[PDB]
Specification:
CATH architecture of the largest domain: 3-Layer(aba) Sandwich
CATH superfamily of the largest domain: Periplasmic binding protein-like II
Structural class: alpha+beta
Main location: secreted
Bound molecules: the ligand *NC1=N[C@@]23[C@@H](N1)[C@H](COC(N)=O)N=C(N*)N2CCC3(O)O
Protein name: Saxiphilin
Shape: globular
Strand content: 15-25%
Subcellular location: Secreted
Number of strands: 30
Function: Binds specifically to the neurotoxin saxitoxin. Its physiological role may be to transport or sequester an endogenous organic molecule other than Fe(3+). It may participate in a detoxification mechanism for neutralizing a microbial toxin.
CATH topology of the largest domain: D-Maltodextrin-Binding Protein, domain 2
Number of domains: 4
Largest sheet: 6 strands, mixed
Keywords: Disulfide bond, Repeat, Secreted, Signal
Strand order of the largest sheet: 12-11-13-10-14-15
Length: 818
């Protein structure tokens, strides 16, 4: 009902009051809280006296910590080569606007951009590629011969596959980061355009270099050092010069410059623990204007009145990008560190750029003469996010109603960056780490001074609940300094902690591994579940005959002799639950591949898959709890469904089903005397069979050959630099606390009085070191069958915020490079 925005200056106050008067969003009232600086506004948000503000991407990390504890919620989205159904989304967004006479993207029946796009109110038409980018020079005015638009849509990777080394592409057609040559066994990494990355080509039999995912994005901004043409100094002569900065906490005015200085060995500075960066910079420059600095010389050149001088606020006339440009223009500084947005063609006569390679270049070369790319700012609020919904509603309705959000006659870059075109809601999962990305996050953590000093002799294990925390505390108090404990809410949180340098290793089931291997983490060890052979456990050199891995199979009755694998469309199938590997993922994947129609909701008959839609076919014949007529629990992902779990999926084939997708164990687990005292009382394993992939059948004990696929074992993973350490400690900690450990009377790794299946599955026999084989790391963990079956041997089969945080954003002018 109310949204309080925090303004840092009188000009932001004036613009905010203008928006209060003019912008009329229903059921939401805008209120303007005035503070004197950026930090004061962050504190006001932390105190609850304000609700939202806009921060430079450099301030997000320090915003996420004490004494602020803020999270980004609303950011400007960037166009990339990963956008799917872009035309439909842009057309919907344009139609949602409350205006008349604006470009509404015209799509075709399939949702693709029409080659010719027109603006009805103006009559101007132009040609456009598959991503909606105007072909240069094709804009035709009304009454003029339109440019004949071709269909520029063929991806460059698929164009290289034709006319043919045959590179691999994904389903959309983009370049796979890992490239494997078939004629010559070579593995290498490629850019977002297939351009080979230097230093990644590996001969065969050698382990391949881990390739990172790349996303080609457009309209990037950069941190640049503007300098007047009348001056003559270069970059390594910055010491003693007078400087203007946009802000002490902005990336375009401080952080990027500090990084470049320390990398070029230009800044005399020990470390963030030995000396603050402001001291080194105050000793580096003579007199400067750096709004927010706590050194007198770094504020001598600022032009703010008493009380307003050197504040992170437009009250200081030299604050911001345009403030730094004004400080340079009025000869109060020799160089101005700002963003590429402040550049203009009206300045290409007096000013020029200052490149870190000790050369000078015109402004138009900012893409090849800068201190680094600067991500867009973000609207942040409290980490508790009590007002995110209201702030988002207000901002979205203000954007739909064409309110003057990103412009003002009072000044530039007030409230938001004037270069901002559109604000979008970020996933509630996104914090500072996910927003900035792993590499930028670690850079900020190192610059602030929070960089964790690694210990090669202590492993920080991550727990996902309180019972695992108690077992880890036991293990740590008994380990003798070799084991420490960190807490997270879920395994993906543990992966994020490991990527943030806050944890060291974690056990992940297979359903979490694709993300982990995507973010660079490698399997340190694999769980060994072979209950019959302790060979590899007693002596690590012993070869693993079988890891005790579960084999997904399709169990059928010996009575039904028509159920074949080529005859699984229809019938009545059985699933252990939605999400489970053997009872859902493997069959759904095999079916979606072999049947190109690929609609499971209509593929089976009255299938029972707990977790689907209660009205769909995948929820019939699921008798939900026999003796509880006071509630309806059919198709529940819990024990309240008598069809959930392996036992329920087997009871499905017993009672009303024709085929049940289960691990191979259930057949022996609910049969042959070793079976419950109810429905499976006189059932025999000889009355059942398995469905093989070639369309035949076989006895149950043939699960190693007549299987749908194999399930990889749970993997304890860590960062690469830590593998040699982690394994080591693990090995030692097994010899003391394994199943045959020397001190097994003091602690067991695979058991606990605090619970069951904590840290590791209690059925785990031991932990076997991962044998890094010279192939694709996902091909080496999942294995070719599982990799191609679930993820199609593709680095693009899944998308999430964490994968986006581990993706390198390759800047480019446009996607026309195809
Ligand atoms: N390097 C390696 N990869 C394997 C095996 N060794 C190891 C043994 O697993 C077995 N035999 O089941 N463990 C795993 N998880 N993998 C992944 C694929 C593989 O069998 O090659």
């Amino acid at each position: 009902k109310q949204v309080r925005w925090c303004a840092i200056s009188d000009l932001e106050q004036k613009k905010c009051n203008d928006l209060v008067g003019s912008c009329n969003v229903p059921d939401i009232t805008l209120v303007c809280v005035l503070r004197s600086s950026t930090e004061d506004c962050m504190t006001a948000i932390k105190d609850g006296q304000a609700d939202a503000m806009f921060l430079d991407s450099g301030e997000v990390y320090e915003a996420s910590k004490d004494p602020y504890n803020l999270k980004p919620i609303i950011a400007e989205p960037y166009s990339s080569n990963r956008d799917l159904q872009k035309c439909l989304k842009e057309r919907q967004q344009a139609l949602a606007k409350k205006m008349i006479g604006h470009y509404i993207p015209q799509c075709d029946e399939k949702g693709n951009y029409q080659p010719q796009q027109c603006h009805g109110s103006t009559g101007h038409c132009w040609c456009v590629n598959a991503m909606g980018e105007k072909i240069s020079g094709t804009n035709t005015p009304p009454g003029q011969t339109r440019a004949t638009c071709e269909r520029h849509e063929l991806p460059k990777c698929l164009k290289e596959r034709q006319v043919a080394f045959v590179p691999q592409c994904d389903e959309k057609g983009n370049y796979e980061p890992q490239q494997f040559h078939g004629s010559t066994g070579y593995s290498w990494c490629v850019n977002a355009i297939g351009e080979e990355i230097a230093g990644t080509k590996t001969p065969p039999g050698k382990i391949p270099a881990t390739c990172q995912k790349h996303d080609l994005v457009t309209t990037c901004h950069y941190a640049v050092a503007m300098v007047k043409k009348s001056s003559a100094f270069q970059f390594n002569q910055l010491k003693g010069k007078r400087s203007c900065h946009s802000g002490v906490s902005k990336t375009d005015g401080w952080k990027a410059l500090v990084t470049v200085l320390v990398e070029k060995k230009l800044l005399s500075w020990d470390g963030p623990a030995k000396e603050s960066i402001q001291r080194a910079m105050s000793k580096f420059f003579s007199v400067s204007c750096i709004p927010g600095a706590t050194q007198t010389n770094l504020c001598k050149q600022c032009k703010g009145e008493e009380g307003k001088n050197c504040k992170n606020s437009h009250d200081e006339p030299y604050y911001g990008n345009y403030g730094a440009f004004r400080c340079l223009k009025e000869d109060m500084g020799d160089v101005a560190f700002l963003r590429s947005t402040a550049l203009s063609d009206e300045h290409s006569e007096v000013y020029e750029l200052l490149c870190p390679d000790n050369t000078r270049k015109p402004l138009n070369k900012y893409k090849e003469c800068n201190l680094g790319t600067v991500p867009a700012g973000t609207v942040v609020t409290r980490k508790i996010s009590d007002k995110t919904e209201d702030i988002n509603n207000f901002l979205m309705e203000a954007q739909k109603r064409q309110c003057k959000l990103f412009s003002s006659a009072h000044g530039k870059d007030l409230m938001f960056d004037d270069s901002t075109l559109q604000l979008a809601l970020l996933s509630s999962e996104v914090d500072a780490f996910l927003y900035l990305g792993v590499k930028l996050f670690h850079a900020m953590k190192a610059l602030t001074g929070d960089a964790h000093l690694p210990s090669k002799n202590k492993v920080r294990w991550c727990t996902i609940n309180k019972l695992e925390k108690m077992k880890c505390d036991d293990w740590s108090a008994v380990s003798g300094g070799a084991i420490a404990c960190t807490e997270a809410s879920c395994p993906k949180g543990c992966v994020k902690q490991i990527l943030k340098g806050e944890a060291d290793a974690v056990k992940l089931e297979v359903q979490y591994m694709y993300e982990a291997l995507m973010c660079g983490l490698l399997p340190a060890v694999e769980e060994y579940h072979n209950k019959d052979d302790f060979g590899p456990c007693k002596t690590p050199g012993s070869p693993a005959t079988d890891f005790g891995t579960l084999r997904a199979v399709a169990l059928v009755k010996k009575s039904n002799k028509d159920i074949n694998w080529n005859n699984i469309k229809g019938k009545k199938s059985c699933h252990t639950g939605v999400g489970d590997i053997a009872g859902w993922v493997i069959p759904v994947s095999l079916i979606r591949r072999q049947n190109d129609n690929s609609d499971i909701d209509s593929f089976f008959g009255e299938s029972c898959a707990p977790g689907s839609d209660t009205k769909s076919n995948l929820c019939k014949l699921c008798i939900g709890d026999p003796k509880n007529s006071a509630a309806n629990t059919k198709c529940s992902l819990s024990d309240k469904e008598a069809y959930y779990g392996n036992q329920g999926a087997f009871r499905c084939l017993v009672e009303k089903g024709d085929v049940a997708f289960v691990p191979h164990t259930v057949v022996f687990e609910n049969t042959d005397g070793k079976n419950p005292a109810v429905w499976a009382k006189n059932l025999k394993s000889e009355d059942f069979e398995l469905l093989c992939l070639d369309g035949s059948r076989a006895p149950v004990s043939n699960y190693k050959s007549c299987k749908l696929s194999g399930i990889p074992p749970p993997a304890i993973v860590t960062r690469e630099e830590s593998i040699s350490d982690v394994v080591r400690i693990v090995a030692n900690q097994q010899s003391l606390y394994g199943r045959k450990g020397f001190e097994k009377d003091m602690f067991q790794l695979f058991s606990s009085n605090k619970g069951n299946n904590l840290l590791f599955n209690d059925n785990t026999q031991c932990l076997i070191t991962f044998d890094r084989q010279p192939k694709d790391i996902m091909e080496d963990y999942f294995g070719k069958p599982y990799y191609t079956t679930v993820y199609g041997a593709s680095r693009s089969a899944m998308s999430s915020e964490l994968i986006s945080a581990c993706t390198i954003k390759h800047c480019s002018n446009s996607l026309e490079v195809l």
